[PDB]
């Protein structure tokens, strides 16, 4: 199982919706995929399919589909507060199993 | 009519599929949306819905839908040759009507 995050970095501007791409290369082992900003114990939960309310986040694909492998998310209304590295992380049934390499979100000036 | 490209820059690595996002804020005037790499007379056509064959390119949404406003594309198999600024451009029936601000694709080292 690999957690693929094709984009190392996104440069976004304030107000935009940013899409963070993540794919899994295997449907087993069984477990949820979570999104976090940062690593280590202080990291922030960004999305959990399993449960919770994430009003700024939507999923590109239907995570409840049996053979879904797309864990990409859209985060709306980006502010300077959102800069960081976002990790797509697979858990086993929970304990962390594998993490993606992270996608850095950086903030840029409007054209 | 605005041509929105939320991401100023994508840092991608070799072999990845990169997604270039573009949305139009209006369905009129009538005309096709093309993708180019670069600006000016020397610019390279990257995608044309109207016609042509672009084996490395797929569209995120169905461009033949009446009320489609999503002109985002996926370019597979990125190499250093793909670095540049990609512009989503609306034509009128053709003459260029409006361009997006461009999304730069840069190449990064693998994690």
mmCIF file of C-alpha atoms in Angstrom:
data_model
loop_
_atom_site.group_PDB
_atom_site.id
_atom_site.type_symbol
_atom_site.label_atom_id
_atom_site.label_comp_id
_atom_site.label_asym_id
_atom_site.label_seq_id
_atom_site.Cartn_x
_atom_site.Cartn_y
_atom_site.Cartn_z
ATOM 1 C CA UNK A 1 0.000 0.000 0.000
ATOM 2 C CA UNK A 2 1.256 3.410 -1.068
ATOM 3 C CA UNK A 3 -0.321 6.784 -0.209
ATOM 4 C CA UNK A 4 0.291 8.981 -3.257
ATOM 5 C CA UNK A 5 0.232 12.763 -3.069
ATOM 6 C CA UNK A 6 1.308 13.873 -6.548
ATOM 7 C CA UNK A 7 1.722 17.562 -5.705
ATOM 8 C CA UNK A 8 4.603 18.436 -3.292
ATOM 9 C CA UNK A 9 3.407 22.014 -3.070
ATOM 10 C CA UNK A 10 0.440 24.207 -4.014
ATOM 11 C CA UNK A 11 0.772 27.918 -4.120
ATOM 12 C CA UNK A 12 -2.672 29.340 -3.489
ATOM 13 C CA UNK A 13 -4.033 32.808 -2.871
ATOM 14 C CA UNK A 14 -6.454 34.037 -0.244
ATOM 15 C CA UNK A 15 -10.110 33.238 -0.891
ATOM 16 C CA UNK A 16 -9.382 30.313 -3.220
ATOM 17 C CA UNK A 17 -10.463 26.703 -2.864
ATOM 18 C CA UNK A 18 -7.423 24.429 -2.831
ATOM 19 C CA UNK A 19 -7.540 20.773 -3.904
ATOM 20 C CA UNK A 20 -5.229 18.380 -2.061
ATOM 21 C CA UNK A 21 -4.830 15.173 -4.064
ATOM 22 C CA UNK A 22 -4.281 11.745 -2.511
ATOM 23 C CA UNK A 23 -4.707 8.227 -3.893
ATOM 24 C CA UNK A 24 -4.206 4.828 -2.234
ATOM 25 C CA UNK A 25 -2.727 2.020 -4.348
ATOM 26 C CA UNK A 26 -4.466 -0.704 -2.291
ATOM 27 C CA UNK A 27 -7.870 -1.251 -0.668
ATOM 28 C CA UNK A 28 -6.362 -3.485 2.063
ATOM 29 C CA UNK A 29 -5.627 -3.341 4.974
ATOM 30 C CA UNK A 30 -9.017 -2.113 6.188
ATOM 31 C CA UNK A 31 -9.046 1.297 7.805
ATOM 32 C CA UNK A 32 -10.026 4.928 7.442
ATOM 33 C CA UNK A 33 -7.972 7.613 5.692
ATOM 34 C CA UNK A 34 -7.635 10.856 7.622
ATOM 35 C CA UNK A 35 -6.176 14.207 6.625
ATOM 36 C CA UNK A 36 -3.927 16.154 8.991
ATOM 37 C CA UNK A 37 -1.988 19.414 8.836
ATOM 38 C CA UNK A 38 1.437 18.786 10.316
ATOM 39 C CA UNK A 39 3.007 15.739 11.888
ATOM 40 C CA UNK A 40 3.490 14.510 15.457
ATOM 41 C CA UNK A 41 1.143 14.737 18.480
ATOM 42 C CA UNK A 42 0.325 18.436 17.870
ATOM 43 C CA UNK A 43 -0.961 17.804 14.324
ATOM 44 C CA UNK A 44 -4.437 19.075 13.379
ATOM 45 C CA UNK A 45 -7.204 16.855 12.030
ATOM 46 C CA UNK A 46 -8.390 18.340 8.722
ATOM 47 C CA UNK A 47 -10.827 15.581 7.628
ATOM 48 C CA UNK A 48 -12.164 12.248 8.891
ATOM 49 C CA UNK A 49 -14.634 10.315 6.730
ATOM 50 C CA UNK A 50 -15.497 8.030 9.604
ATOM 51 C CA UNK A 51 -16.962 10.967 11.589
ATOM 52 C CA UNK A 52 -16.896 14.674 12.585
ATOM 53 C CA UNK A 53 -17.931 17.963 10.917
ATOM 54 C CA UNK A 54 -15.552 19.687 8.473
ATOM 55 C CA UNK A 55 -17.590 22.499 6.860
ATOM 56 C CA UNK A 56 -14.659 23.809 4.758
ATOM 57 C CA UNK A 57 -13.880 20.360 3.334
ATOM 58 C CA UNK A 58 -15.484 18.261 0.617
ATOM 59 C CA UNK A 59 -14.223 15.079 -0.997
ATOM 60 C CA UNK A 60 -13.662 14.850 -4.746
ATOM 61 C CA UNK A 61 -14.907 11.224 -4.830
ATOM 62 C CA UNK A 62 -17.510 9.240 -2.911
ATOM 63 C CA UNK A 63 -15.509 7.725 -0.051
ATOM 64 C CA UNK A 64 -18.300 5.233 0.741
ATOM 65 C CA UNK A 65 -17.759 3.436 -2.591
ATOM 66 C CA UNK A 66 -16.390 -0.059 -2.109
ATOM 67 C CA UNK A 67 -13.556 0.350 -4.601
ATOM 68 C CA UNK A 68 -12.797 4.001 -3.992
ATOM 69 C CA UNK A 69 -9.103 4.844 -3.978
ATOM 70 C CA UNK A 70 -9.372 8.661 -4.303
ATOM 71 C CA UNK A 71 -8.962 10.526 -1.017
ATOM 72 C CA UNK A 72 -8.564 13.982 -2.540
ATOM 73 C CA UNK A 73 -10.228 16.870 -0.711
ATOM 74 C CA UNK A 74 -11.149 20.481 -1.522
ATOM 75 C CA UNK A 75 -10.608 23.122 1.245
ATOM 76 C CA UNK A 76 -12.507 26.316 0.599
ATOM 77 C CA UNK A 77 -11.711 29.873 1.657
ATOM 78 C CA UNK A 78 -7.946 29.581 2.095
ATOM 79 C CA UNK A 79 -6.301 32.124 4.443
ATOM 80 C CA UNK A 80 -2.687 32.581 5.545
ATOM 81 C CA UNK A 81 -3.673 30.393 8.545
ATOM 82 C CA UNK A 82 -3.900 27.372 6.236
ATOM 83 C CA UNK A 83 -0.278 27.235 5.204
ATOM 84 C CA UNK A 84 1.399 23.982 6.200
ATOM 85 C CA UNK A 85 2.036 20.457 4.995
ATOM 86 C CA UNK A 86 -1.096 18.291 4.639
ATOM 87 C CA UNK A 87 -0.777 14.567 5.046
ATOM 88 C CA UNK A 88 -3.117 11.907 3.829
ATOM 89 C CA UNK A 89 -2.847 9.082 6.399
ATOM 90 C CA UNK A 90 -4.143 5.520 6.399
ATOM 91 C CA UNK A 91 -5.040 3.907 9.724
ATOM 92 C CA UNK A 92 -5.557 0.267 10.647
ATOM 93 C CA UNK A 93 -8.361 -0.897 12.974
ATOM 94 C CA UNK A 94 -7.205 2.820 15.237
ATOM 95 C CA UNK A 95 -3.414 2.890 14.679
ATOM 96 C CA UNK A 96 -1.550 4.786 11.951
ATOM 97 C CA UNK A 97 -0.467 2.457 9.139
ATOM 98 C CA UNK A 98 1.045 4.659 6.393
ATOM 99 C CA UNK A 99 1.332 8.341 5.559
ATOM 100 C CA UNK A 100 1.611 10.138 2.274
ATOM 101 C CA UNK A 101 4.684 12.303 1.696
ATOM 102 C CA UNK A 102 2.675 15.493 2.359
ATOM 103 C CA UNK A 103 1.532 18.355 0.143
ATOM 104 C CA UNK A 104 2.693 21.739 1.230
ATOM 105 C CA UNK A 105 0.258 24.588 0.944
ATOM 106 C CA UNK A 106 1.944 27.979 0.514
ATOM 107 C CA UNK A 107 0.356 31.372 0.088
ATOM 108 C CA UNK A 108 1.079 33.652 -2.825
ATOM 109 C CA UNK A 109 0.071 37.136 -3.927
ATOM 110 C CA UNK A 110 -2.859 37.586 -6.282
ATOM 111 C CA UNK A 111 -1.925 38.176 -9.954
ATOM 112 C CA UNK B 1 -16.836 36.384 -17.299
ATOM 113 C CA UNK B 2 -13.836 35.440 -15.190
ATOM 114 C CA UNK B 3 -11.418 32.552 -15.842
ATOM 115 C CA UNK B 4 -10.398 31.301 -12.395
ATOM 116 C CA UNK B 5 -7.218 29.325 -11.819
ATOM 117 C CA UNK B 6 -7.051 28.936 -8.036
ATOM 118 C CA UNK B 7 -3.514 27.535 -7.911
ATOM 119 C CA UNK B 8 -0.693 29.963 -8.928
ATOM 120 C CA UNK B 9 1.837 27.158 -8.824
ATOM 121 C CA UNK B 10 2.040 23.364 -8.556
ATOM 122 C CA UNK B 11 5.228 21.691 -7.589
ATOM 123 C CA UNK B 12 5.137 18.222 -9.086
ATOM 124 C CA UNK B 13 7.643 15.416 -9.423
ATOM 125 C CA UNK B 14 8.536 13.303 -12.424
ATOM 126 C CA UNK B 15 6.061 10.552 -13.278
ATOM 127 C CA UNK B 16 3.131 12.201 -11.488
ATOM 128 C CA UNK B 17 -0.209 13.251 -12.927
ATOM 129 C CA UNK B 18 -0.768 16.961 -12.352
ATOM 130 C CA UNK B 19 -4.230 18.545 -12.155
ATOM 131 C CA UNK B 20 -4.568 22.080 -13.515
ATOM 132 C CA UNK B 21 -7.760 23.670 -12.196
ATOM 133 C CA UNK B 22 -9.823 26.221 -14.120
ATOM 134 C CA UNK B 23 -13.413 27.414 -13.720
ATOM 135 C CA UNK B 24 -15.435 29.932 -15.752
ATOM 136 C CA UNK B 25 -17.867 32.188 -13.872
ATOM 137 C CA UNK B 26 -20.160 32.577 -16.915
ATOM 138 C CA UNK B 27 -21.521 30.365 -19.704
ATOM 139 C CA UNK B 28 -21.763 33.332 -22.126
ATOM 140 C CA UNK B 29 -20.303 34.459 -24.499
ATOM 141 C CA UNK B 30 -20.327 31.254 -26.549
ATOM 142 C CA UNK B 31 -16.942 29.787 -27.344
ATOM 143 C CA UNK B 32 -14.480 27.014 -26.618
ATOM 144 C CA UNK B 33 -11.975 26.970 -23.753
ATOM 145 C CA UNK B 34 -8.459 25.958 -24.740
ATOM 146 C CA UNK B 35 -5.395 25.226 -22.636
ATOM 147 C CA UNK B 36 -1.974 26.563 -23.613
ATOM 148 C CA UNK B 37 1.519 26.449 -22.129
ATOM 149 C CA UNK B 38 3.001 29.918 -22.408
ATOM 150 C CA UNK B 39 1.703 33.124 -23.913
ATOM 151 C CA UNK B 40 2.145 34.888 -27.255
ATOM 152 C CA UNK B 41 2.376 33.436 -30.797
ATOM 153 C CA UNK B 42 4.878 30.712 -29.774
ATOM 154 C CA UNK B 43 2.552 29.252 -27.113
ATOM 155 C CA UNK B 44 1.770 25.515 -27.210
ATOM 156 C CA UNK B 45 -1.746 24.096 -27.399
ATOM 157 C CA UNK B 46 -2.188 21.668 -24.490
ATOM 158 C CA UNK B 47 -5.918 20.856 -24.905
ATOM 159 C CA UNK B 48 -8.821 21.733 -27.206
ATOM 160 C CA UNK B 49 -12.255 20.247 -26.490
ATOM 161 C CA UNK B 50 -13.517 21.302 -29.885
ATOM 162 C CA UNK B 51 -11.017 18.964 -31.616
ATOM 163 C CA UNK B 52 -7.562 17.296 -31.750
ATOM 164 C CA UNK B 53 -5.865 14.390 -29.920
ATOM 165 C CA UNK B 54 -4.261 14.973 -26.500
ATOM 166 C CA UNK B 55 -3.376 11.494 -25.170
ATOM 167 C CA UNK B 56 -1.756 12.819 -21.954
ATOM 168 C CA UNK B 57 -4.781 14.967 -21.079
ATOM 169 C CA UNK B 58 -8.172 14.174 -19.586
ATOM 170 C CA UNK B 59 -10.833 16.544 -18.315
ATOM 171 C CA UNK B 60 -12.095 16.367 -14.737
ATOM 172 C CA UNK B 61 -15.675 17.200 -15.833
ATOM 173 C CA UNK B 62 -17.776 16.459 -18.904
ATOM 174 C CA UNK B 63 -17.163 19.489 -21.124
ATOM 175 C CA UNK B 64 -20.164 18.626 -23.334
ATOM 176 C CA UNK B 65 -22.590 19.331 -20.464
ATOM 177 C CA UNK B 66 -24.728 22.381 -21.134
ATOM 178 C CA UNK B 67 -24.035 24.014 -17.779
ATOM 179 C CA UNK B 68 -20.462 22.872 -17.327
ATOM 180 C CA UNK B 69 -18.157 25.504 -15.872
ATOM 181 C CA UNK B 70 -15.218 23.232 -14.894
ATOM 182 C CA UNK B 71 -12.340 23.272 -17.375
ATOM 183 C CA UNK B 72 -9.833 21.498 -15.142
ATOM 184 C CA UNK B 73 -7.514 18.990 -16.810
ATOM 185 C CA UNK B 74 -5.201 16.185 -15.658
ATOM 186 C CA UNK B 75 -1.803 15.824 -17.460
ATOM 187 C CA UNK B 76 -0.201 12.459 -16.888
ATOM 188 C CA UNK B 77 3.467 11.487 -16.852
ATOM 189 C CA UNK B 78 5.010 14.853 -15.991
ATOM 190 C CA UNK B 79 8.659 15.375 -17.043
ATOM 191 C CA UNK B 80 10.991 18.362 -16.690
ATOM 192 C CA UNK B 81 9.800 19.289 -20.223
ATOM 193 C CA UNK B 82 6.384 20.200 -18.806
ATOM 194 C CA UNK B 83 7.478 23.068 -16.620
ATOM 195 C CA UNK B 84 5.853 26.353 -17.603
ATOM 196 C CA UNK B 85 2.781 28.466 -16.994
ATOM 197 C CA UNK B 86 -0.499 26.919 -18.208
ATOM 198 C CA UNK B 87 -3.310 29.200 -19.225
ATOM 199 C CA UNK B 88 -6.959 28.392 -19.474
ATOM 200 C CA UNK B 89 -8.286 30.605 -22.302
ATOM 201 C CA UNK B 90 -11.804 31.379 -23.481
ATOM 202 C CA UNK B 91 -12.366 32.148 -27.163
ATOM 203 C CA UNK B 92 -15.288 33.796 -28.927
ATOM 204 C CA UNK B 93 -16.653 32.546 -32.276
ATOM 205 C CA UNK B 94 -12.272 32.035 -33.183
ATOM 206 C CA UNK B 95 -10.766 35.033 -31.329
ATOM 207 C CA UNK B 96 -9.342 35.041 -27.795
ATOM 208 C CA UNK B 97 -11.792 36.578 -25.318
ATOM 209 C CA UNK B 98 -10.273 36.131 -21.830
ATOM 210 C CA UNK B 99 -7.385 34.288 -20.219
ATOM 211 C CA UNK B 100 -6.924 32.919 -16.753
ATOM 212 C CA UNK B 101 -3.998 34.229 -14.706
ATOM 213 C CA UNK B 102 -1.988 31.040 -15.369
ATOM 214 C CA UNK B 103 -0.885 28.154 -13.162
ATOM 215 C CA UNK B 104 2.809 27.581 -13.062
ATOM 216 C CA UNK B 105 4.018 24.022 -13.075
ATOM 217 C CA UNK B 106 7.412 23.574 -11.401
ATOM 218 C CA UNK B 107 9.392 20.407 -10.880
ATOM 219 C CA UNK B 108 10.576 19.232 -7.500
ATOM 220 C CA UNK B 109 12.644 16.361 -6.138
ATOM 221 C CA UNK B 110 10.921 13.217 -4.922
ATOM 222 C CA UNK B 111 10.527 12.940 -1.118
#
